[PDB]
Write a protein that binds this ligand. Structure first.
Ligand code: CLA
Ligand code: CLA
Ligand code: CLA
Ligand code: CLA
Ligand code: CLA
Ligand code: CLA
Ligand code: CLA
Ligand code: CLA
Ligand code: KC1
Ligand SMILES: CC1=C(/C=C/C(C)=C/C=C/C(C)=C/C=C/C=C(C)/C=C/C=C(C)/C=C/C2=C(C)CCCC2(C)C)C(C)(C)CCC1
Lengths: 160, 168, 250, 165, 153
């Protein structure tokens, strides 16, 4: 496989470690499904750190019983022990459904990153590859940005 | 099974249950009118019995003899019947209603059959013909449940000395 | 139809009970019930008491009759008769409803294991789960003694390694010198001695019985078995030494 | 259904109710569905033993582990795992590793019924008509329904133990 | 058809298909039911009081000690609302939309529509969805009231 949505321009078929010399045709889609899912999580993850930094923490109470003004929970690592395990369980449940929804089993329409969002469905103006490639490329950038951001929040100690 | 009585049908995951595991219907088919009449009249009274035990706890009748505390479900009976009392007021009332049932089905209840059983004729809410079938099963399913419910209420409440809605 | 089964008074036997009797009794016995069969008593009495016959009985005679007839509960129902008629069919067809012994009894596992083997008259071909199941067959076939493609010395080496490694334990522990500072070289020597003794026995077997299932074509008879036994001795030495080395080092 | 017919009449609350309220089986091939069942039965069979092992250990019977540690280990099975000597755990892993190797490579289950690790399919009938037998489908229900209950049961034990003691 | 109403048309300034609308319809009716349950559910801890009582887990004889519109918690009934959440899932995994052949039909277990009063299609199907839409806005508006404008009433 050398002609999918991943080959943008600055690098060609970038497989230095040779996962494609033996990458089966379904393995590409499986790994592509992994890449699309990873990239979309990273975009949500990145927003989830840069947005509470500039925009203040949620005006609210997070847990109506355990006094969480969103300000005692820091933006970054360590918030895992600050957010309640149930608010952690409830986001785990919500993400649990989002895959136990319309299936992403091998060969299913959910297995190539298609789920039915269609926020940006341009009327096929030679832009379906543009939006697809942009999502993949941004997800690749978001994953790299997050890992640096995670190391930023860890090695320094807090936030950035 | 049991004539065309609606105890079965519309009865859960299976469409029809037909629970007669002693054969009291096949062995005594002439009494299917009597059994329905008894089963329904049991359900209606039990439903009023369960809804009974709860409402005296909030409102009390203006008879001014029932207007006294400590008359729970373990002493109201033996207290009201006097040297006559409120319990006879209820019993006379139940006689008036039960006499009406005699007139509709004759003295010996000869007119009692497998379709007029437990049908006093009070039709205000029901509509159509299939709903009457649906409502008749809804009647019994509620009625049979309350018959076991008030049975548990009376036994558990007086054994464990509860005398109130939790009955525990 | 049969004469005595018509118009029989209900007082002699009830209708449902009589039908249950007729169902339980085989059809060929209706005409002349054998003897000591409830139907025999029904015939011997219904031919005496009935509409055209003696219509009354003494109280004691009727009491004894009522204790000779079935009491409507000692007779198998239709489903039980089906159970028997099908269980016997299974048993005679060479299939066994699989059951497993338990606390003085057996639980039926609800499985039909075909019992008679390919040779139905052979006694040792009755197929059981523990010897003729897929796992049992593949486990026995994959043993060193049976594994395909193994040279005889390889089978001997594998079996000997197993035996020599295992045989050290019973001596180095709970042995005569179990508490001595060494307590394991003694076990090593005893295990090697046991391996040598059983290898000598195998050599006796191969020089007397001479099995020829391991010999390659055109060889001295029993040569494969002798090679297997010699390499079992070598493997026993090796396994005993390896177990001793592990015990001493660790 | 087509392909889910190979695992038909074997799940749901009632035996013939294909539950799948996520579409995890539709569009999947026959071998994949059979492999999904092989995962289900293997999880459930271990879960059944796991629950039994949990209860015989949470009541006070941890002989091998009381006689190896020379002290009565704690009744809490999660905490008793830590106290159990590391030699015992490694041997426990190795024994299961040998069993998992044994079933897979040397004595593989068939490819049409990949859960027949004992291999009854070569002596079983499963398609006869006798009543006092041929209830093998019913005993398949009891294995699956019990095992499914054991799967959620053992997770409840672990989750509650690791959280609310 | 179905939920098309009277004061507005298809009201789609944004689905607009068949299969996608069917899934959206299932979401619409589902959200409608909860709001109607929640809206009438919120008015009840008000007048008629915090009705509950009896021996509950860590809440024996609890007179619905979860106060306010949010319910708070503090081991008061709101922890028991998790049981509502769990048993809500049981109905959501047994009587669900995967075997729900029409939009949001659960085969009418109660048979209320078998002439008991509701009817199939026509106004009743349109009245259910329209009432759900009103309650969903009402429940959300009630959420704003409890948050920064006092309590319900
Ligand atoms: C979850 C991560 C993930 C996965 C599954 C994929 C998967 C894929 N990418 Mg991809 N990619 C990723 C991340 C990922 N990518 C990131 C972060 C970038 C930005 C640098 C890219 C940039 C990129 C380009 C430019 C192209 C692809 C392409 C592809 C496809 C074929 C190549 C292949 O087999 O890659 C398999 C990938 C993996 C097996 C990931 C293994 C990662 C190793 C184990 C670690 C790498 C070092 C890591 C950064 C260390 C982190 C440090 C940490 C420990 C502290 C395939 C679908 C090509 C394509 O679409 O061809 C048609 C293509 O042209 N990707
Ligand atoms: C383009 C993305 C990006 C950006 C803008 C930054 C930005 C920064 N990094 Mg950084 N970093 C990134 C990705 C990024 N990082 C990645 C992907 C890694 C892992 C390979 C790191 C690993 C890293 C380390 C180890 C350190 C930084 C540090 C820094 C700071 C100097 C600065 C805020 C320094 C810092 O502030 O400490 C965390 C520092 O010592 N970076
Ligand atoms: C005293 C109460 C009472 C009475 C008189 C009846 C009477 C009847 N029931 Mg019934 N039922 C009851 C309580 C009662 N039920 C309760 C509490 C339940 C819930 C478990 C049910 C559940 C039930 C089902 C599911 C069905 C019936 C049916 C029937 C009818 C035929 C079976 C029969 O002969 O029962 C008579 C039984 C007795 C007189 C025994 C009384 C108790 C002994 C003495 C102990 C008959 C009219 C069937 C029906 O309507 O057929 C269409 C049917 O399908 N019943
Ligand atoms: C103790 C309470 C009580 C009361 C208040 C009544 C009251 C009445 N019964 Mg009645 N009845 C009772 C108990 C009672 N009954 C009992 C225990 C039985 C036996 C089960 C009957 C059997 C019965 C029959 C058979 C008839 C009445 C009838 C009547 C009415 C005739 C009026 C009359 O003669 O007044 C003074 C009247 C409404 C008659 C009626 O109206 O029915 C047509 C009638 O024919 N009763
Ligand atoms: C009385 C006990 C006894 C017996 C009958 C045998 C018997 C045998 N030994 Mg032996 N052996 C024994 C004790 C014994 N061993 C002990 C205690 C040791 C440890 C020193 C050994 C070490 C030993 C070696 C190192 C070898 C044998 C070998 C042999 C075989 C020739 C024969 C089967 C030989 C063999 O197996 O070759 C086929 C061989 O090489 N033995
Ligand atoms: C894997 C091969 C191996 C290794 C690493 C060792 C290692 C050791 N052996 Mg050993 N041994 C082996 C095979 C091996 N042996 C075999 C095959 C035999 C049978 C002939 C022996 C017979 C043997 C004896 C008789 C003795 C050792 C002893 C020793 C120790 C010196 C040392 C730990 C000596 C020792 O330390 O004993 C306590 C000792 O006395 N070994
Ligand atoms: C290892 C787990 C596992 C696996 C692989 C299967 C596999 C299967 N089940 Mg099954 N089941 C399980 C556990 C499992 N089951 C448990 C625990 C229960 C009890 C609720 C059931 C109850 C059940 C019913 C009632 C039915 C099946 C059926 C089936 C078959 C259809 C495929 C399917 O449903 O999805 C296969 C794929 C999965 C099950 C994926 C596993 C679950 C994913 C990973 C998400 C779950 C994560 C969870 C929410 C969080 C974990 C903690 C949790 C305990 C709270 C298939 C063979 C149907 C069948 O064959 O009937 C004919 C059927 O009707 N199952
Ligand atoms: C999922 C299966 C499973 C797993 C992973 C474990 C794992 C473990 N068990 Mg265990 N156990 C199980 C099932 C299981 N058990 C069952 C079904 C029983 C009932 C017989 C037991 C009874 C049991 C006892 C009595 C003890 C353990 C102990 C232990 C621990 C040390 C290993 C050991 O001695 O096991 C030994 C296991 C057995 C002797 C049971 C054999 C029965 C097998 C499963 C039949 C096939 C280890 C964490 C020991 C401990 O200290 O616990 C912390 C211990 O003393 N288990
Ligand atoms: C342990 C005591 C016990 C209770 C408490 C109980 C309760 C209910 N059973 Mg039940 N039951 C058994 C015991 C008990 N059942 C046993 C041993 C068997 C095997 C013979 C059995 C079988 C059936 C069948 C075949 C049906 C059935 C029914 C109902 C029903 C109605 C609900 C509804 O319709 O309102 C309720 C409340 C019908 C059904 O609807 O089940 C949902 C029906 O078809 N049951
Ligand atoms: C208890 C149990 C069981 C059983 C088990 C068993 C049976 C085991 C066995 C085991 C064994 C039995 C093991 C063994 C091993 C062995 C080894 C491991 C060996 C090795 C050896 C070696 C290595 C050697 C080498 C050498 C040689 C060959 C010669 C020269 C010298 C040398 C030394 C080099 C069962 C399952 C039933 C159930 C329950 C559990």
């Amino acid at each position: 496989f050398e002609s999918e949505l991943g080959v943008q321009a600055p690098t060609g078929f970038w497989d230095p470690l040779g996962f494609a010399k033996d990458g089966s045709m379904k393995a590409f889609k499986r790994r592509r499904a992994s890449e699309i899912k990873h990239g979309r999580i990273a975009m949500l993850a990145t927003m989830g750190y840069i947005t509470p930094e500039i925009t203040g923490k949620f005006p609210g109470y997070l847990s109506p019983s355990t006094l969480l003004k969103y300000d005692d929970i820091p933006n970054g690592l360590g918030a895992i022990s600050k957010v309640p395990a149930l608010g952690w369980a409830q986001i785990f449940v919500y993400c649990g459904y989002a895959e136990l929804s319309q299936d992403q089993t091998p060969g299913s329409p959910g297995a190539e990153g298609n789920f039915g969002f269609k926020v940006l469905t341009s009327s096929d103006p030679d832009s379906l590859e543009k939006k697809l490639a942009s999502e993949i490329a941004n997800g690749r950038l978001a994953m790299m940005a997050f890992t640096g951001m995670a190391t930023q929040d860890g090695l320094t100690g807090s936030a950035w | 099974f049991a004539g065309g009585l609606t105890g079965s049908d519309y009865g859960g995951f299976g469409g029809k249950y037909e629970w007669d595991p002693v054969g009291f219907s096949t062995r005594w088919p002439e009494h299917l009118a009597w059994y329905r009449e008894a089963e329904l009249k049991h359900g209606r009274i039990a439903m009023l019995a369960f809804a009974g035990l709860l409402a005296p706890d909030l409102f009390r009748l203006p008879w001014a003899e029932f207007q006294d505390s400590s008359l729970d479900f373990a002493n109201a009976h033996d207290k009201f019947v006097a040297g006559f009392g409120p319990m006879w007021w209820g019993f006379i009332a139940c006689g008036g209603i039960e006499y009406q049932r005699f007139r509709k089905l004759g003295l010996g209840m000869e007119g009692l059959t497998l379709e007029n059983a437990g049908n006093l004729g009070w039709f205000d809410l029901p509509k159509n013909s299939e709903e009457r079938l649906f409502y008749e099963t809804a009647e019994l399913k509620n009625g049979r449940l309350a018959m076991l419910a008030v049975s548990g209420i009376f036994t558990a409440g007086i054994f464990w000395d509860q005398h109130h809605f939790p009955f525990i | 139809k049969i004469a005595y089964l018509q118009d029989i008074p209900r007082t002699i036997v009830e209708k449902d009970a009589l039908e249950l009797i007729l169902k339980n009794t085989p059809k060929e016995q209706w005409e002349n019930p054998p003897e000591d069969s409830y139907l025999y008593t029904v015939k011997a009495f219904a031919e005496m008491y009935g509409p055209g016959k003696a219509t009354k009985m003494g109280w004691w005679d009727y009491y004894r009759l009522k204790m000779d007839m079935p009491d409507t509960t000692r007779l198998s129902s239709e489903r039980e008769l089906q159970e028997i008629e099908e269980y016997e069919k299974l048993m005679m067809s060479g299939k066994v409803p699989f059951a497993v012994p338990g606390p003085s009894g057996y639980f039926f596992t609800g499985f039909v294991t075909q019992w008679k083997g390919k040779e139905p008259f052979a006694g040792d071909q009755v197929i059981t789960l523990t010897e003729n199941g897929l796992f049992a067959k593949q486990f026995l076939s994959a043993l060193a003694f049976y594994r395909e493609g193994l040279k005889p010395w390889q089978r001997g080496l594998e079996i000997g390694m197993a035996h020599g490694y295992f045989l050290i334990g019973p001596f180095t522990s709970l042995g005569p010198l179990r508490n001595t500072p060494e307590a394991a070289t003694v076990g090593l020597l005893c295990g090697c001695a046991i391996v040598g003794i059983v290898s000598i026995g195998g050599l006796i077997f191969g020089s007397t019985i001479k099995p020829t299932r391991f010999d390659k074509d055109g060889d001295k008879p029993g040569a494969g078995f002798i090679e297997m036994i010699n390499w079992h001795a070598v493997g026993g030495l090796g396994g005993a030494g390896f177990a001793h080395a592990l015990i001493t080092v660790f | 259904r087509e392909a889910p017919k190979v695992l038909a009449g074997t799940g749901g609350p009632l035996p013939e109710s294909f539950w799948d309220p996520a579409g995890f089986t539709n569009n999947k091939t026959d071998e994949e569905l059979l492999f999904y069942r092989a995962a289900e039965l293997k999880h459930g069979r271990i879960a059944m033993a796991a629950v039994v092992g949990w209860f015989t250990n949470a009541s006070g019977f941890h002989y091998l582990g009381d006689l190896w540690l020379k002290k009565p280990a704690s009744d809490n099975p999660i905490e008793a795992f830590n106290q159990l000597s590391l030699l015992g755990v490694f041997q426990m892993v190795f024994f299961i590793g040998c069993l998992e190797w044994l079933t897979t490579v040397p004595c593989p289950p068939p490819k049409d019924a990949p859960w027949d690790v004992i291999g009854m399919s070569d002596v079983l009938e499963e398609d006869t008509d006798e009543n006092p037998m041929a209830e093998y489908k019913k005993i398949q229900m009891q294995e699956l329904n019990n095992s499914r209950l054991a799967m959620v049961a053992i997770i409840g034990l672990i989750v509650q133990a690791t959280t609310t003691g």
